[PDB]
Design a protein around this nucleic acid. Structure first.
Length: 34
RNA sequence: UAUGUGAUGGAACCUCUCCGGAUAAUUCUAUCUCUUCUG
């Protein structure tokens, strides 16, 4: 197979969602911020 | 650490309301100090 590397260089900041359980991955807190 | 024919989340102002305020002449006279030995 062939591998094509990619790089993403952020500039200022970005948003991160927190960890959720497998059974609770369809809540409002997960759908928003997906 | 995703799973793939489908992600406007850049898709949302911690915004709004509240006298560091009130009262006071930089003025002025009565003592202080305890053990003395027969008196």
């Amino acid at each position: 197979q062939h591998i094509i590397p990619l790089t993403i260089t952020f500039l200022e900041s970005f948003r991160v969602i927190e960890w959720h359980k497998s059974s609770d991955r369809n809540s409002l807190r997960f759908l928003r911020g997906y």
